[PDB]
UniProtKB/Swiss-Prot annotation:
Keywords assigned: Antibiotic resistance, Methotrexate resistance, NADP, One-carbon metabolism, Oxidoreductase, Trimethoprim resistance
The protein's Enzyme Commission number: 1.5.1.3
GO biological process: 10-formyltetrahydrofolate biosynthetic process; dihydrofolate metabolic process; folic acid biosynthetic process; folic acid metabolic process; one-carbon metabolic process; response to antibiotic; response to methotrexate; response to xenobiotic stimulus
Transmembrane segment boundaries: none
Protein name: Dihydrofolate reductase
GO CC aspect terms: cytosol
Binding site for substrate: 5, 27, 52, 57, 113
NCBIfam families given in the database record: PRK10769.1 (NF008037)
Pfam families xrefs: DHFR_1
Length: 159
């Protein structure tokens, strides 16, 4: 099973200048809980944005060019990325925009955080078709001293 996990600001913005400008510790904790002990697939730009391997997860990087770091696994196509995960129950695709576009048709589940923040961005989460997806979990949180915007955790499953 393939799942996508992402945090979206207003208008589906996910990034600006290869960075995420907001800081929401509760959402990073949600990201860790839902990805730990699973393989994670990311594109090369997202690898450069994170800047280090994510511990406790098999890190798989998509790039057309040879890898430059043997602490992670480098693959050259979507099919190779999936194969490199082996026989696991759930593969987590962690972006960025171009990678989400390619894996969305193959995904059964979306883990989305909707952040109430207006962000100038240059990268967006793909338009998906709402009729194809059923919301099976949602949890709203007001802003607090640690998290400066309100946010909604949602899990959607392909109908
Ligand atoms: N808010 C969130 O949830 C979230 C999550 C992830 C990322 N982001 C943000 O998203 C932005 C990065 O997204 P992006 O769309 O620019 O880049 P991306 O999807 O991270 O990376 C694209 C790169 O991945 C490689 N790639 C993708 N598909 C491939 C394929 N089929 N075969 C081989 N290589 C492939 C290529 O690398 P080569 O050029 O080396 O071939 C391509 O240039 C940043 O702003 C980051 O902060 C946000
Ligand atoms: N909901 C969501 N939020 C994100 O921030 C996010 N980020 C990415 C890609 N970028 C990043 C950037 C930083 C870390 C990171 O530092 N993660 C730590 C945080 C642990 C914690 O804060 O408790 C990790 O070990 O996962 C992960 C992914 C992909 N999907 C996402 N999905
Ligand atoms: Mn092929
Ligand atoms: Mn197999
Ligand atoms: Mn806000």
């Amino acid at each position: 099973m393939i799942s996508l996990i992402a945090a979206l600001a207003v208008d589906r913005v996910i990034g600006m200048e290869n960075a995420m400008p907001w800081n929401l510790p509760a959402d990073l904790a949600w990201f860790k809980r839902n990805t730990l002990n699973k393989p994670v697939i990311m594109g090369r730009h997202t690898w450069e944005s994170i800047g280090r391997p994510l511990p406790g997860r098999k890190n798989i990087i998509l790039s057309s060019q040879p890898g430059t770091d043997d602490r992670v696994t480098w693959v050259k196509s979507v099919d190779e990325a999936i194969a490199a995960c082996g026989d696991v129950p759930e593969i987590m695709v962690i972006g960025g925009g171009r990678v989400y576009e390619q894996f969305l048709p193959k995904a059964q589940k979306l883990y989305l955080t909707h952040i109430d923040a207006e962000v100038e961005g240059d990268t967006h989460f793909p338009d998906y078709e709402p009729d194809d997806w059923e919301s099976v979990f949602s949890e709203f949180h007001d802003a607090d001293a640690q998290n400066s915007h309100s946010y909604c955790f949602e899990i959607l499953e392909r109908r």
